[PDB]
Design a protein around this ligand. Structure first.
Ligand SMILES: CCc1oc2ccccc2c1C(=O)c1cc(Br)c(O)c(Br)c1
Ligand SMILES: CCc1oc2ccccc2c1C(=O)c1cc(Br)c(O)c(Br)c1
Ligand SMILES: CCc1oc2ccccc2c1C(=O)c1cc(Br)c(O)c(Br)c1
Ligand SMILES: CCc1oc2ccccc2c1C(=O)c1cc(Br)c(O)c(Br)c1
Length: 557
């Protein structure tokens, strides 16, 4: 009947009022905080009326019809019918809304705000986060909200408040921005590549996680797991949160049929039990696993009868025994097995045709393995910071048309891949290094899709997801870009480049590094090292030693 009262009865008042605040923040990202709370409380009071009587007025309307009405009370997005109106909001989700940045006030200032109005301080947290990230995971933001409340609850009455709160707030910023681009990858995989390619992706990853389960259960998982993200990316956060919450009850209703590391996983509350399974470790692979059967006479019979089930079962049986290989590499091996099967089964002697099919995977498996150990030898020999600077010049020349801040954020996330995963043995480098790069590059694709400038990046992102990383590798040197004219205001740093912390000083030095390549791309690697050291030494020597404010505004070159 009334779907509004249905979700309110299953999600609860605390979650219903929180999900609506996130949905409105993702749609109308420009309106202030006070205007959104007036609509949420109006919907919350509306929801409580339909629960006491399902046969009430306006309760039978869909969730998209009611949300669009309350949102249109304040740029030509409520046009034509409802399916086009709600789709207008999804097309205007600005990946970077050019909003004022968030500053971190003092610790004693935040605890006085948390102790004054504890509900507003938590409500303003979900509003400011969801408005910057329109594609943020709705039920996972509630998990961060619970810890954001517990962080201020414990360490605002402690002795040294900054000794605990800031470490908890610094660790919470990293998980949030990592989950911002991780979920953004799943939304772009559904909107741009449809449900067919996204479903095959989840089968490869879940089979590596849960090899002890059967394909019939993984199919029930992936089908139910895909329906959740299709709702969260479309803005159906009320639906998205419910299905994920009841899925964790289904996964843990029978743990032996799914995995084995789910005992202490589901010993936690509902919000915490849904987070443990999302990043759980891979189950132990069942030993004495067979090889193939690609040798029977019914290979073409099972494929012609069901092409999706046979290819889906092959990817499952291949991923359950290969945890050391990523999903992008296995999907590449899956697309090769399909191509080698369309041409062999259409002949007269297919068995002799697809006989040596697994030998064709050798060049595709050794291609990423010989590219990870090569790039990490320079990461463990130059440092994480200099690794990003070497990757800055490596990417500023391959695509100089891209903006200045975009090349810095993408390289800093690329440099964080070596320091976070390439310290692991030779059994976990290939999975993470390709899964982490698929998130950083996708973050560079959605940030470039707003205002595109470079054409080599557009076709690189518009290509297949499995061939997205190989395209970005050797994207030419772009020996045809005219460098911008010499700008002086971009290189001159004011006297306020010293009151910032040590972290912000590195982002400014990297911002000026890509700005130097845009002025002279033909500069050598050593000609930039001396210039970078000179500029850093000038600011370091002028500001650390007291020398007024005109000493940092002279003439460098
Ligand atoms: C007034 C206190 C406060 O309000 C917010 C609203 C949205 C997101 C974070 C915060 C926040 C923080 O404590 C915070 C913590 C870290 Br660490 C940051 O790097 C930034 Br920026 C902000
Ligand atoms: C505890 C504070 C905090 O919680 C988060 C949850 C998810 C994503 C980011 C954050 C975050 C930030 O520090 C933060 C920092 C900057 Br800068 C932003 O522009 C935004 Br927005 C958020
Ligand atoms: C086991 C690791 C894993 O890798 C994926 C890749 C694509 C889509 C889903 C998953 C997935 C999940 O099982 C999963 C389960 C829940 Br519950 C989530 O809230 C999220 Br997020 C992910
Ligand atoms: C950051 C760690 C890392 O992990 C990998 C796994 C496979 C292939 C390359 C890499 C790699 C790189 O250093 C790297 C370097 C350049 Br230059 C690129 O354009 C791209 Br893309 C990636």
């Amino acid at each position: 009947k009334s779907e509004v009262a249905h979700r309110f009865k299953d999600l609860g008042e605390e979650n219903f009022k929180a999900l609506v605040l996130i949905a409105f923040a993702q749609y109308l990202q420009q309106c202030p905080f006070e205007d959104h709370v007036k609509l949420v409380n109006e919907v919350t009071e509306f929801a409580k009326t339909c629960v006491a009587d399902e046969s009430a007025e306006n309760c039978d309307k869909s969730l998209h019809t009611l949300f669009g009405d309350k949102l249109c009370t304040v740029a030509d997005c409520c046009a034509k019918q409802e399916p086009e109106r709600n789709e207008c909001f999804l097309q205007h989700k600005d990946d970077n809304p050019n909003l004022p940045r968030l500053v971190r006030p003092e610790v004693d200032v935040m605890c006085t705000a948390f102790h004054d109005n504890e509900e507003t301080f938590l409500k303003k947290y979900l509003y400011e986060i969801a408005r910057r990230h329109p594609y943020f995971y709705a039920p996972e933001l509630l998990f961060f909200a619970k810890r954001y409340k517990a962080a201020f609850t414990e360490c605002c009455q402690a002795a040294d408040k900054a000794a605990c709160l800031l470490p908890k707030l610094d660790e919470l910023r990293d998980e949030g921005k990592a989950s911002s681009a991780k979920q953004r990858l799943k939304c772009a995989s559904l909107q741009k590549f449809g449900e067919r390619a996204f479903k095959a992706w989840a089968v490869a990853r879940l089979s590596q996680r849960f090899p002890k389960a059967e394909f019939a259960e993984v199919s029930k998982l992936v089908t139910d797991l895909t329906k959740v993200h299709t709702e969260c990316c479309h803005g159906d956060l009320l639906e998205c949160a419910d299905d994920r919450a009841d899925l964790a009850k289904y996964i843990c209703e029978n743990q032996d049929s799914i995995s084995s590391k789910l005992k202490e996983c589901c010993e936690k509350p509902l919000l915490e039990k849904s987070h443990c399974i999302a990043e759980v470790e891979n189950d132990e692979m069942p030993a004495d696993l067979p090889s193939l059967a690609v040798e029977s006479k019914d290979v073409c019979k099972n494929y012609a009868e069901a092409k999706d089930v046979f290819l889906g079962m092959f990817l499952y049986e291949y991923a359950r025994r290969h945890p050391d290989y990523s999903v992008v590499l296995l999907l590449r091996l899956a697309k090769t097995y399909e191509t080698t099967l369309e041409k062999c089964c259409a002949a007269a002697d297919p068995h002799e045709c697809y006989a040596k099919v697994f030998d064709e995977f050798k060049p595709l498996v050794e291609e990423p393995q010989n590219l990870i150990k090569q790039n990490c030898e320079l990461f463990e020999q130059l440092g994480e910071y200099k690794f990003q600077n070497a990757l800055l010049v490596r990417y500023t020349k391959k695509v100089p048309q891209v903006s200045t801040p975009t090349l810095v954020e993408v390289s800093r996330n690329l440099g964080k891949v070596g320091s976070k995963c390439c310290k692991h043995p030779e059994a976990k480098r290939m999975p993470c290094a390709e899964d982490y790069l698929s998130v950083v590059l996708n973050q560079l694709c959605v940030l470039h899709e707003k205002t595109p400038v470079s054409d080599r990046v557009t076709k690189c992102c518009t290509e297949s997801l499995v061939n997205r990383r190989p395209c970005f590798s050797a994207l030419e040197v772009d020996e045809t870009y005219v460098p911008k004219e010499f700008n002086a205001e971009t290189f001159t740093f004011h006297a306020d480049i010293c009151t910032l912390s040590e972290k912000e000083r590195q982002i400014k030095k990297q911002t000026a590094l890509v700005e130097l390549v845009k002025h002279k791309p033909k500069a050598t690697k050593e000609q930039l090292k001396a210039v970078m050291d000179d500029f850093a030494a000038f600011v370091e020597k002028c500001c650390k030693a007291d020398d007024k404010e005109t000493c940092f505004a002279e003439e460098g070159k």
